[PDB]
Structures are given as C-alpha cells and as structure tokens.
C-alpha cells in the first residue's frame, strides 16, 4: 500500500529537487489506485521518515550496487523502516529498452531521417566504483543497434568518455541521455561534453522526463504488490 519513489540527491537547494520527485509520484499515483504513492529526494533531510516496514521503495537509480544493497537499507533502518522492501531500480526496469526505442524512433521521424540510416549515442553517468551502470548502458545500446545504423555509449565517469564517444559522428545522429532525473542530468553538463566533441546530431531530453515513465513505474509497483 505505501510506496515511496526515491531519487538520489544532488548539490544545491533540495526544495526544487523534492518538488520534481513529488510531481513524478503524482503522475504515477492515478495509475496505482491500490497504493498511496509519494516522492522523495535524498537531498532533503528526513526524506525517508514517512516510510515504515510495510513501505515499498522504487529507487530512481541506474543500477543495483552498494547503495541499493547496503546504504539505502541503512538510511531506511535508522529512519524506523528496516523491513522496507526495495524494488528493482529505474535502470533495470523491464520497460526501459522499449521506452528508449520509442523516443529515438519518434525523434528520427520528426527529423525526416530513416532510423536504419541514423547513428545512436547512449550518454550516461557510468561509475568509477562499479561495472553495473556501464554494462546496463551497453545492454541498452545493443538492444537499439538492430533498428539503427549503429549504437554506442559515452560516459561521464569512465571510458569511453562522452567527449571521445561523440567525436567524428555524422550529422544524422541522435544522443539519448540515460538519466533518471533532470537534477542528475544537469550536474553532468552533457552540452559542454558534446560541444567539445563537435557533436552535430540531435540531443534529446533525459529519458526520466519521458511521458511514458509514470506508466512504466506504475507497472513495476503493481507487479510487486499482492
Ligand atoms: Na516507430
């Protein structure tokens, strides 16, 4: 019944970060009538004190790791919710590869470019402490590649660096930022990295802002309820 959609915090004022996650949880809410859905950012002190032992946590994270396995359970157990169930993260959501494909196909159609003749670039944060985020982004690119000319990845934290990965690509290219929130996306400053690369293609909004994301999260919540 109780569901909390949790975002990683980012530097700056936590109030607009909290409002963004509340706005997302409000779009999820009418799609899961059997549950009480609310949003929280870990940048806000007391983010998790509304959670209890019967609350489900939908983490807006790109992969599983030390945070999902040890940190988030510690930050919940202290808050009074040790038995709170953590669902698979946004990055491992079964609907994410189809969502990326629909956004890229829609984008190619607006440009008047055939998808088979378009080069794809999946831009993601990656990680310096785990191999899980880059393996997940490569799985996305490898799933998109059969529908396009080619698909590769570029990262902020690890090689291949986005400034290198976006270099020497054609004009008919689309970059999809594989980010769950606008706050995490803006921090990485993809426009500066793509400018250094001389990227000439189309740069889409981050995947976490797509219109189908609330329905995707709702289906993952519904599947975890009994
Ligand atoms: Na299509």
Residue numbers in the entry: 3 to 228
Can you list sentences taken from the study reporting this PDB entry?
However, our in vivo functional data has demonstrated that Pp-CbiX acts as a ferrochelatase, by acting to insert iron into the tetrapyrrole substrate in preference to cobalt ion.
The structural overlay shows the metallated tetrapyrrole fits into the central cavity in Pp-CbiX and indicates that the active site residues in Pp-CbiX are located in the CT half of the protein, similar to Se-CbiK but unlike CbiXL and SirB that have active site residues in their NT. The overlay highlights the conserved position in the active site of the (His127) residue of Pp-CbiX with the equivalent His residue in Se-CbiK (His145), shown to be involved in metal binding in the bound tetrapyrrole. The functional importance of (His127) from Pp-CbiX was demonstrated by mutating this residue to alanine, which resulted in the loss of in vivo ferrochelatase activity of Pp-CbiXH127A. Mutagenesis of (His187) in our protein demonstrated that this residue was indeed essential for the ferrochelatase activity of Pp-CbiX. Interestingly, in the structure of Pp-CbiX, the functionally essential (His187) points away from the active site of the enzyme. So it is feasible that (His187) of Pp-CbiX is also at a very flexible region of the structure, and this crystal form has captured the (His187) residue in an inactive conformation in which it is moved out of the way of the active site.
